[PDB]
Design a protein around this ligand. Sequence first.
Ligand SMILES: CCCCCCCC/C=C\CCCCCCCC(=O)OC[C@@H](O)CO
Ligand SMILES: CCCCCCCC/C=C\CCCCCCCC(=O)OC[C@@H](O)CO
Ligand SMILES: CCCCCCCC/C=C\CCCCCCCC(=O)OC[C@@H](O)CO
Ligand SMILES: CCCCCCCC/C=C\CCCCCCCC(=O)OC[C@H](O)CO
Ligand SMILES: CCCCCCCC/C=C\CCCCCCCC(=O)OC[C@H](O)CO
Ligand SMILES: CCCCCCCC/C=C\CCCCCCCC(=O)OC[C@H](O)CO
Ligand SMILES: CCCCCCCC/C=C\CCCCCCCC(=O)OC[C@H](O)CO
Ligand SMILES: CCCCCCCC/C=C\CCCCCCCC(=O)OC[C@H](O)CO
Ligand SMILES: CCCCCCCC/C=C\CCCCCCCC(=O)OC[C@H](O)CO
Ligand SMILES: CCCCCCCC/C=C\CCCCCCCC(=O)OC[C@H](O)CO
Ligand SMILES: CCCCCCCC/C=C\CCCCCCCC(=O)OC[C@H](O)CO
Ligand SMILES: [Cl-]
Length: 242
Amino acid sequence: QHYGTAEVNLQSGNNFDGSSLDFLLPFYDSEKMLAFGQVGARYIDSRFTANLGAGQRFFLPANMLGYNVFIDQDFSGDNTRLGIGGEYWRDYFKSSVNGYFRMSGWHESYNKKDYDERPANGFDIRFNGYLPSYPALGAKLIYEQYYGDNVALFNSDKLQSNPGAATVGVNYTPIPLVTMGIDYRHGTGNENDLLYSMQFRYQFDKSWSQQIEPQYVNELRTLSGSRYDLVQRNNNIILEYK
Ligand SMILES: CCCCCCCC/C=C\CCCCCCCC(=O)OC[C@@H](O)CO
Ligand SMILES: CCCCCCCC/C=C\CCCCCCCC(=O)OC[C@@H](O)CO
Ligand SMILES: CCCCCCCC/C=C\CCCCCCCC(=O)OC[C@@H](O)CO
Ligand SMILES: CCCCCCCC/C=C\CCCCCCCC(=O)OC[C@H](O)CO
Ligand SMILES: CCCCCCCC/C=C\CCCCCCCC(=O)OC[C@H](O)CO
Ligand SMILES: CCCCCCCC/C=C\CCCCCCCC(=O)OC[C@H](O)CO
Ligand SMILES: CCCCCCCC/C=C\CCCCCCCC(=O)OC[C@H](O)CO
Ligand SMILES: CCCCCCCC/C=C\CCCCCCCC(=O)OC[C@H](O)CO
Ligand SMILES: CCCCCCCC/C=C\CCCCCCCC(=O)OC[C@H](O)CO
Ligand SMILES: CCCCCCCC/C=C\CCCCCCCC(=O)OC[C@H](O)CO
Ligand SMILES: CCCCCCCC/C=C\CCCCCCCC(=O)OC[C@H](O)CO
Ligand SMILES: [Cl-]
């Protein structure tokens, strides 16, 4: 009957501690094409942010191409951002690229006394792969890049010019319902951080028992099982300061 995904994320490790809930909700669903909306919110790094997007995914037997557009709103700091994303996915392999475009201007900072803040423009490229012979095991590679004289990519107490970072992570999905992982990130100025995270994933089209059985993890990681996965993007609005 119903199709799509609800996902809770819990994360900790430093600056971006908190929780989130997101939904992927199809409005047109055929073998060749899916059109969907995605909506969610999060309380992370002492800010409340909500996000609304839509896109399409186009399917071939061996691959999927997709695009999406997002509006990101940090209600705590009143910062607004436009997002655009592309997708190229296959069995056991999900690649995405995302662009992050400021829609609001300088204004008095929410967290930093004596500063103005606004969204930092940037992009990221994201890969998630799963071992085909043991798909419960996944790896994550991200490159991200942001622009401005004083950007807070790692935290807002160490501001940096045009910072970039590479993330490498591993994660484990014993059953489709839950994924746990650890992400290591290294960036400019020799910044490093660690992110521990757990996701609870509910698939609307799956029975309860299917979602707590290890044998359905492989299905989830194939192209056709992954079709309702959330967009891979950063839903947090990275800020710059002046
Ligand atoms: C702020 C300016 C940026 C623009 C924001 C607009 C965001 C919308 C983005 C993507 C929406 C595209 C999805 C809409 C595409 C729907 C296609 C469809 O359902 O066709 C089915 C028929 O073929 C059945 O016969
Ligand atoms: C579905 C799409 C997946 C395909 C991935 C796309 C491949 C992208 C290839 C190369 C991206 C390299 C970006 C280039 C790296 C940018 C570095 C920069 O902007 O300057 C930093 C200085 O200004 C600091 O002061
Ligand atoms: C710390 C534990 C966090 C809670 C774990 C929750 C796991 C799922 C995560 C988000 C789910 C929220 C939305 C859950 C929505 C479920 C709707 C439902 O029950 O299906 C109707 C069908 O039975 C009709 O046939
Ligand atoms: C090979 C695979 C390796 C993976 C194995 C690594 C194990 C780490 C697992 C889970 C960490 C869970 C962290 C949960 C985060 C705590 C909740 C939180 O910090 O946020 C609450 C916040 O107050 C709300 O707004
Ligand atoms: C600036 C222009 C971009 C537009 C941005 C708006 C976001 C959604 C847009 C259009 C929905 C168009 C119609 C498609 C919506 C449902 C499609 C449909 O007709 O479904 C048929 C039915 O499901 C058969 O089983
Ligand atoms: C900047 C972009 C703003 C985003 C705005 C984009 C427009 C669509 C977005 C969300 C719709 C929410 C999803 C709609 C849920 C409808 C469910 C439905 O139609 O059920 C029929 C079935 O899903 C058919 O298979
Ligand atoms: C920029 C707009 C001004 C600000 C607006 C703030 C409020 C909008 C929040 C969320 C919209 C998306 C919610 C869509 C939820 C629809 C899900 C649904 O009803 O479809 C499932 C149903 O079971 C199928 O038959
Ligand atoms: C740009 C600002 C956007 C702000 C947006 C307001 C805050 C929305 C926050 C969280 C989710 C919103 C609730 C949407 C719930 C839809 C889920 C749904 O329709 O469920 C389908 C059903 O469960 C099938 O089994
Ligand atoms: C139909 C199949 C669709 C598949 C194809 C979808 C194509 C669009 C996808 C992603 C957009 C990525 C946007 C990346 C923009 C880079 C932003 C940037 O580089 O800003 C730096 C600026 O110059 C400061 O100096
Ligand atoms: C559809 C597939 C799309 C894939 C594309 C994703 C990767 C490229 C993204 C951004 C590159 C932008 C290049 C910007 C790097 C240099 C900007 C710069 O030099 O900064 C301004 C200057 O320093 C002032 O003095
Ligand atoms: C536990 C420490 C790390 C362990 C976890 C590391 C998992 C491996 C990650 C990426 C390699 C696998 C990526 C999969 C690449 C296959 C590309 C593909 O599309 O394969 C088609 C499929 O084999 C037929 O349909
Ligand atoms: Cl990701």
